[PDB]
Amino acid sequence: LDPNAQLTTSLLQTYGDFSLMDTYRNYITGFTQHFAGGWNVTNYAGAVHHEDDIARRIWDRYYEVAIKNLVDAIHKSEDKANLNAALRIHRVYLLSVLADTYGDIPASEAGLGYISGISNPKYDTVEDLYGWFFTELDACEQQLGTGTDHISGDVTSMGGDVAKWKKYANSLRMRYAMRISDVNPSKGQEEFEKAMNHADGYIASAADDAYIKYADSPYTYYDGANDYDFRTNALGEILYGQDPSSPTFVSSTLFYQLQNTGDPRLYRICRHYYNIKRSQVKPDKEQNIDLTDEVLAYFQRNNIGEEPCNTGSAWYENWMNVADAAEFPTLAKLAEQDANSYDNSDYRARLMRPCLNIDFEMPSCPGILITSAEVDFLLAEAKTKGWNVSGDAESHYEAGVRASMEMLNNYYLTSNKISEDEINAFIANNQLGENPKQTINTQAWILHMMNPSEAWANMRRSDYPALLDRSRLATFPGDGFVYDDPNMSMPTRLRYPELEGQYNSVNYKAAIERMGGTDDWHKKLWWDKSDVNVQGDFNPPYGKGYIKIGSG
């Protein structure tokens, strides 16, 4: 009821609501090809399988909680200009996620009547929404600091500092100006330069990174869905999984991007776990038994190597030979003590695959809004476009790579931090090269691994990184997965919630007619001009690659 408390709830929901995270585990982080091998991502993204109850969650949960709270608090804060501006900025942020997910969405008519359930809003067009983002963020950025009120509900890294909220608003303007740079290059350039030249500045260093701060509190997964306090980061929670036999595995797309470039992030992101006794309350190092070094030593002894799971395949598909516990001295000692716990062959099978480091799965992980590393990559790309940016593209790109590594050191890694020498060597071996747009946006995709909505939006916009071509990778109908969409390319949006067809029937129909007459998750959004690039060949040294030509 207090508008600062409504700001708090709406900020925390962003990453703190487990009941929308199935959309991120099952679809979006699979679409981006960061993760593959878990059952959930294989069944949904991996099979290009639409299910309304999964696809609808970002829409239903953000409109039911955050948008209702924000709209109510905005109406009730006209006397508190600083809070009012912060509420409106977070509303822009969430509406941009909603529009980048679904396309045309309720916004301009999503007011007091709509959140009370008595009014049907039209769906604003993506083009009109993006235009409004620029005017609203300009207005909010100037309104910040014209109040004397304390933004006491701020749970972000901005810590109620209006100067930091101003830099955040200008950085969002820069992101959205890049987003529209293919469909409207002149507006993109104008808006980008206006924001980057603004007297109040943008996020230029990690000290001004914008993220939501989450607490070290126990995980509860789907339990108590009615009573969510949103205090912990539910993205890392769902990636850890409610089921120890289905943790999140790193895809071959991400694995080979890292390995092929000598990226020191390879075995910071990827670890090998034997996790049968792991805590579900809070990921623990004691029983997420990290056997990475011993697994790599076994590979070296046997002239073999990693088999990261391909997009479309589960860990139990494209079966990788399972080493005996005797191959890993730590596990061998444990199994000689207690075979029921430590000689389980299913848990040893999952030990063979590269797993996401539990450092990315802890309750207190930050919820990234926008980082200085992203802004560095935006400046690098703007320079390559010929926009009026200070400093050469190489300098901005190198700043972005360095800041992406330091982000891991500062926000995630609890051990084995990436050294300055490792960063400098990686940068020296990975310059912009012949296709700077590809290099910049592939590095940004690594940066956005824990910010899946931005990863997916920027990949759709820039069409990089080149993904694995799903149509050239195996399917597994004999394993119970359903392949009901003959177009296997990565979806470019999600379908609208099907209940909208009843609950807001006229406006749902009109939005669907505008995209050509069916609710098509292969239809590109207004700012998405071209198809994402795909890798022309994939023949990994171990495991399975593209199916052999002519065998399909």
Ligand X SMILES: OC[C@H]1O[C@@H](O[C@H]2[C@H](O)[C@@H](O)[C@H](O)O[C@@H]2CO)[C@H](O)[C@@H](O)[C@@H]1O
Feature table: binding site for Mg(2+) = 460, 463, 528, 530
> For the purposes of burial, counting CB atoms within 10 Å of the CB of 415, is it exposed (0-12), middle (13-18) or buried (19 or more)?
exposed
- When binding is defined by CB under 5 A, the residue of 213, 528, 538, 546 that contacts Mg ion is 528
Task: Decide if residue 263 touches ligand X (CB under 6 A).
Answer: no
- Residues facing 348 on adjacent strands: none
What is the token pair recorded at 436? 């700077």
DSSP string, 213-275: --------TTTTGGG----S-HHHHHHH-SSTTS-PBBBHHHHHHHHHTT-TTHHHHEE-EE-
Shortest distance, position 22 Cβ to ligand X, whole Å: 5
Shortest distance, position 40 Cβ to ligand X, whole Å: 5
Shortest distance, position 462 Cβ to Mg ion, whole Å: 7
Judged by beta carbon distances under 5 to 8 A according to partner kind, the member of ligand X, Mg ion, none in contact with residue 222 is ligand X
Task: Decide if residue 479 touches ligand X (CB under 6 A).
Answer: no
**Is the torsion defined by CA of 78, 130, 181, 488 positive or negative?**
positive
Task: Decide if residue 197 touches Mg ion (CB under 5 A).
Answer: no
Judged by beta carbon distances under 5 to 8 A according to partner kind, the member of Mg ion, ligand X, none in contact with residue 40 is ligand X
Closest CA to 22 of 2, 1, 51: 51
Looking at residues 337 to 376 of the shown chain, list those that interact with Mg ion (rule: CB under 5 A).
Answer: none
Looking at residues 218 to 257 of the shown chain, list those that interact with ligand X (rule: CB under 6 A).
Answer: 222
The smaller minimum CB distance to Mg ion, of residues 136 and 463, is found at 463
Binding residues with Mg ion: total (CB under 5 A):
4
Shortest distance, position 39 Cβ to ligand X, whole Å: 6
Alpha-carbon distance of 387 to 8, in angstroms, equals 38
- When binding is defined by CB under 6 A, the residue of 11, 13, 22, 236 that contacts ligand X is 22
Judged by beta carbon distances under 5 to 8 A according to partner kind, the member of Mg ion, ligand X, none in contact with residue 528 is Mg ion
Task: Decide if residue 500 touches Mg ion (CB under 5 A).
Answer: no
153: region left, alpha or beta (phi > 0 left; psi from -120 to 50 alpha): alpha
Shortest distance, position 451 Cβ to ligand X, whole Å: 22
Closest CA to 464 of 449, 444, 483, 447: 444
Task: Decide if residue 463 touches Mg ion (CB under 5 A).
Answer: yes
The smaller minimum CB distance to ligand X, of residues 40 and 492, is found at 40
Closest CA to 105 of 68, 130, 73, 84: 130
Task: Decide if residue 319 touches ligand X (CB under 6 A).
Answer: no
Kindly give the interhelix angle for 372-384 and 436-447, rounded to the nearest 10 degrees.
Answer: 170
The smaller minimum CB distance to Mg ion, of residues 350 and 460, is found at 460
Task: Decide if residue 100 touches Mg ion (CB under 5 A).
Answer: no
CB atoms within 10 A of CB 251: 28
Shortest distance, position 222 Cβ to ligand X, whole Å: 5
Shortest distance, position 547 Cβ to Mg ion, whole Å: 25
3-state helix, strand, coil in the chain (%, to 5): 50, 5, 45
Task: Decide if residue 40 touches ligand X (CB under 6 A).
Answer: yes
Alpha-carbon distance of 304 to 290, in angstroms, equals 20
CB atoms within 10 A of CB 394: 15
Task: Decide if residue 42 touches ligand X (CB under 6 A).
Answer: no
Region from 12-20, 129-137, 455-463, 472-480 binding Mg ion, contact rule CB under 5 A: 455-463
> For the purposes of burial, counting CB atoms within 10 Å of the CB of 517, is it exposed (0-12), middle (13-18) or buried (19 or more)?
exposed
Task: Decide if residue 146 touches Mg ion (CB under 5 A).
Answer: no
Site residues for ligand X per CB under 6 A:
22, 40, 222
- The contact set with Mg ion (CB under 5 A) reads 460, 463, 528, 530
